[PDB]
Amino acid sequence: GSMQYFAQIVNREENKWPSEPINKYIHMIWIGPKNISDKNIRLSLQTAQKNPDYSTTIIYDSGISGYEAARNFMSEKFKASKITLVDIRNKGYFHQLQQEPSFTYYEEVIRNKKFAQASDILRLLVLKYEGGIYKDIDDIQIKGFGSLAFPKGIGVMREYVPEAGKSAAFPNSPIAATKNNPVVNKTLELAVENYRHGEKNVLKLAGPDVFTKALYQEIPGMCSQVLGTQLEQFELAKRQALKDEQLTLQEKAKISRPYKAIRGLSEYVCNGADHS
Ligand SMILES: O=c1ccn([C@@H]2O[C@H](COP(=O)(O)OP(=O)(O)O)[C@@H](O)[C@H]2O)c(=O)[nH]1
Ligand SMILES: [Mn+2]
Ligand code: NA
Ligand code: NA
């Protein structure tokens, strides 16, 4: 055994996944016939104003009854801002997006006027085809994102146990992603299965619990328990090197680095889940 070798494989682990740059697009969704709220207009203007280096868009859908009046209302409220409104059906890639099995279910869900539920599918499809940052219309921009880059090209906020929930879930807003990101693709694959199975449980469709399952499948160490087992494997390697044998704070920080970095949207957006 060699402590020189050990220090080197700890250094290697820290740097295993180079940070991948995120496209400077902020995607938000306001689909359906309802007038966007005064609060969500203010939060949207604030999102765009804090991010002058980003193109901020609100996506609507001309395939939904009553879309025109809702689109017109938004056009008037955002006329002074750099926010642009875009029809999902106008996207250059819509011909391919329309053929996605998940888009079949998006169409079924918007027909039943479940727009929040439909947004869980649509946010993933937009990230798949464009990359950038998806944010809920009702999420608070704390400060500008600036130039972001994430290990495995995926950025999320910290997990927590949601209201009346059992297990910790990563929120599915905001999400930063490289185009065609494996985590986004896995979430869509799990969602298509849940919908094909005729799932009625709203926690088992395309929401935070499904996003969390996708993140754990693609990046196992995102689970605090699995990272624990990885740290224990390095502790064993340190014992082998020295055969004082416990991992230092610095060693644990190095081994955990990319998993902490993936939670890097935590400081930029507040979803109000932590409000009194
Ligand atoms: O009529 C509606 C209702 C919701 N949404 C979108 O769906 C997102 C998710 O819904 P919501 O924020 O209500 O979900 P939660 O914050 O409870 O997860 C919203 O932020 C909007 O971006 C929409 O486009 N039209
Ligand atoms: Mn929300
Ligand atoms: Na499932
Ligand atoms: Na190891």
Author numbering: 15 to 257, 268 to 300
Task: Give passages from the manuscript.
The respective glycosyltransferases are important virulence factors such as the Clostridioides difficile toxins A and B. Here, we describe two glycosyltransferases of Yersinia species that have a high sequence identity: YeGT from the zoonotic pathogen Yersinia enterocolitica and YkGT from the murine pathogen Yersinia kristensenii. We show that both modify Rho family proteins by attachment of GlcNAc at tyrosine residues (Tyr-34 in RhoA). sYeGT has a cone-shaped structure comprised of a globular domain with a Rossmann-like fold on top of a three-helix bundle. The catalytically active domain is the Rossmann-like fold domain, which features a 6-stranded antiparallel β-sheet flanked by 7 α-helices.
Interestingly, in the absence of ligands, sYeGT crystals belonging to space group P43212 appeared rapidly and diffracted X-rays up to 2.3-Å resolution while in the presence of UDP-GlcNAc, P21 crystals were visible only after 8 weeks but diffracted better, with a resolution up to 1.12 Å. The asymmetric unit of the ligand bound sYeGT crystal comprises two molecules. Each protomer includes the complete N-terminal part of the construct but lacks 14 residues at the C-terminal end. Although sYeGT was crystallized in the presence of the substrate UDP-GlcNAc and Mn+2, only the UDP moiety was visible in the electron density map suggesting that the sugar nucleotide had been hydrolyzed during the crystallization process. The uracil moiety is mainly stabilized by residues from the WIG-motif (residues 44–46). In detail, Trp-44 forms a stacking interaction with the purine base, and backbone atoms of Ile-45 and Lys-48 form hydrogen bonds with the polar side of the base. The ribose moiety is stabilized by hydrogen bonds to main chain atoms from residues Ile-43 and Ile-151 and to the gamma-oxygen from Ser-133. The manganese ion is coordinated on one side by the pyrophosphate moiety of UDP and on the other side by the carboxylic groups of Asp-150 and Asp-152, the residues of the DxD motif. Notably, a third aspartate residue, Asp-153, is indirectly involved in the manganese coordination via a water molecule. Another notable feature is the loop flanking the nucleotide binding site (loop F, residues 171–188), which is bent toward the nucleotide when the latter is present.
